Design an enzyme around this catalytic site. Structure first.
Site, PDB file in Angstrom:
ATOM      1  N   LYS B 113       6.805  -6.147   5.219  1.00 22.04           N
ATOM      2  CA  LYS B 113       7.450  -5.038   4.504  1.00 22.04           C
ATOM      3  C   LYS B 113       8.802  -4.706   5.109  1.00 22.04           C
ATOM      4  O   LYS B 113       8.967  -4.789   6.326  1.00 22.04           O
ATOM      5  CB  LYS B 113       6.643  -3.733   4.599  1.00 22.04           C
ATOM      6  CG  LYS B 113       5.137  -3.791   4.530  1.00 22.04           C
ATOM      7  CD  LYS B 113       4.617  -2.354   4.593  1.00 22.04           C
ATOM      8  CE  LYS B 113       3.105  -2.270   4.705  1.00 22.04           C
ATOM      9  NZ  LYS B 113       2.607  -0.866   4.543  1.00 22.04           N
ATOM     10  N   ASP B 241       0.778  11.918   3.787  1.00 24.38           N
ATOM     11  CA  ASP B 241       1.202  11.229   2.559  1.00 24.38           C
ATOM     12  C   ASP B 241       0.703   9.789   2.401  1.00 24.38           C
ATOM     13  O   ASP B 241       0.991   9.119   1.403  1.00 24.38           O
ATOM     14  CB  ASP B 241       2.720  11.303   2.426  1.00 24.38           C
ATOM     15  CG  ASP B 241       3.236  12.706   2.627  1.00 24.38           C
ATOM     16  OD1 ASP B 241       3.766  12.998   3.721  1.00 24.38           O
ATOM     17  OD2 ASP B 241       3.062  13.530   1.706  1.00 24.38           O
TER      18      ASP B 241
END
Lengths: 318, 326
Positions: B113, B241
């Site tokens: 990523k 989150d």
């Protein structure tokens, strides 16, 4: 792991990195002209990492990776054999002569020598490199000329260091009992020095000349040797080569035996045509000669030095 | 002989994970990680002139954060450095389904990523704690298992990356996916995701679909216990989150797909996970499916100014996920 001097560690790290790096870049069908102008450069800066042997920051530069890599196979040296000679165990010192230059190293296995050249020399190697390589192409790697296997520039403490690795004249096994530095020049500096009273003295022209020096190669090998010489000094002549000499190493077998015996006593002869050549067996009495041209890089002007160098050496052999 | 990729960025990566891993093969494995190891790094600046440029940029930089700690995190997650190295250097890493970029090694085993400068900093703050956590879980967590973090630069442009073992398996295919955040109803559904590719379904999508998620009763225990301590660890820090990634793999459907492939070689011309390798999988109580679940975003109306905090998100995340499986 690495060496003592941080530069010896950056060397081993460099010849290791560059050779591995080269193992992934395919062998070309031929060397393009750019390959004689190319280079590889690496700048390392490790923070609190990998510093038990290497400097935390250092640079390594390899001149014309592809051309030397080819010069290697052309001299029948396997890159990995080359790599291990330099990275397996730190390179020991030999004897950096008391004049022009700085240092003279040799791999732990005595097979390759690492001479610390100057910025000037590194520039000379580049000027001659293309022709020299073409020469090596048409000799099949058979010459008394230094066989350059690699040229690098390491930097530690912002201090640049240049080096030129080359297969040594003397063998990695047999010991050189008596040495010489035959320049061939018309009588000038060539004799008794503190060296005569040194570990292993580097005797010169007249020292060798007055000793009525015995160098019996035969009439079969003396021919083949002198014929190489003719084309080398001629090649160098083709390109203004500055004062080069012929290195001469003598190895007395019988003496070697005694030395070898004592070593075996405390606990209580053959070169190798390929893996440690430049050797010459004596026609009769047990000796091996090691001869090859030497400072190809850097009082009459040198074009005439050719015929003189060959004529001096032309009389040595019998 | 290891060539490179298409994008110069992918070539500098392969060159980097190859250089750093080989470089690490010479620096001995410590008895323990010193505190400095969480502050260290390795930096390399390449400038090749007319040399080695058929795949690599002539000039580029590569930086590896805390080489020793991730290298340890690797063995701690049972990954061989050379296996890690080959997955990244053998064949250029293909793109995935990025939600900036999301790559995956040719072998689908590791995912690469592109994080942000902020995240790379978050990694440093948590790295020592996270590593200690991994020490006392025996690499058995639903938490992302970080295997390496790098910063490549080409055209003076820095790029940050965080390599991690993937949630879904490298062998089995994910037929239906989910991104369960567990948050109290809001954007608990997917917009243009329902498109046509593999949609990243959300809370309410999963909630309305009468979602069957039969893991069993022995595995449901081990999962929920594993989940309890993770979300609790993340809570201990400040992390929030983050969501739970859910991948479903229907075997019977897989068969058909596999058959047609074998059918074309006839016309036109064993089954589940490895506990060890694909270690996030879950077999369905009945022989019919495989689930892939792991926590994921560990880094980065009425009244907005008065919402949910880290310590509150924990119990919620576990409570939502507590009902998914049966």
């Amino acid at each position: 792991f690495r060496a003592s001097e941080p530069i010896l560690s950056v060397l081993m790290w460099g010849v290791n990195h560059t050779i591995n790096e080269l193992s992934n870049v395919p062998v070309p069908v031929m060397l393009m002209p750019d390959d004689f102008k190319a280079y590889s450069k690496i700048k390392v800066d490790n923070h609190l990492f990998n510093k038990e042997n290497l400097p935390s920051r250092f640079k390594f530069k390899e001149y014309c990776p592809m051309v030397f890599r080819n010069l290697r196979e052309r001299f029948g040296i396997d890159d990995q054999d080359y790599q291990n000679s330099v990275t397996r165990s730190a390179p020991i010192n030999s004897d950096s002569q008391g004049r022009c230059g700085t240092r003279f190293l040799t791999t732990y296995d005595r097979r390759f020598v690492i001479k610390t050249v100057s910025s000037e020399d590194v520039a000379e190697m580049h000027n001659i490199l293309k022709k020299y390589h073409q020469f090596i192409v048409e000799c099949h790697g058979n010459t008394l000329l230094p066989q350059f296997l690699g040229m690098y520039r390491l930097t530690v403490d912002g201090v640049e260091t240049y080096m030129v690795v080359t297969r040594n004249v003397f063998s990695h096994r047999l010991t050189v009992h008596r040495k010489y530095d035959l320049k061939g020049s018309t009588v000038a500096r060539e004799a008794s020095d503190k060296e005569k009273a040194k570990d292993l003295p580097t005797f010169k022209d007249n020292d060798f000349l007055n000793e009525g020096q015995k160098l019996h190669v035969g009439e079969e090998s003396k021919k083949n040797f002198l014929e190489k010489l003719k084309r080398d000094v001629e090649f160098l002549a083709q390109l203004k080569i500055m004062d080069y000499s012929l290195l001469v190493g003598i190895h007395d077998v019988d003496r070697a035996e005694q030395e070898e015996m004592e070593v075996e006593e405390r606990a209580e002869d053959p070169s190798v045509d390929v893996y440690a050549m430049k050797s010459h067996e004596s026609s009769p009495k047990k000796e091996v000669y090691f001869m090859a041209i030497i400072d190809i890089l850097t009082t009459v002007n040198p074009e005439q030095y050719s015929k003189r160098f060959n004529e001096f050496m032309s009389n040595i052999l019998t």
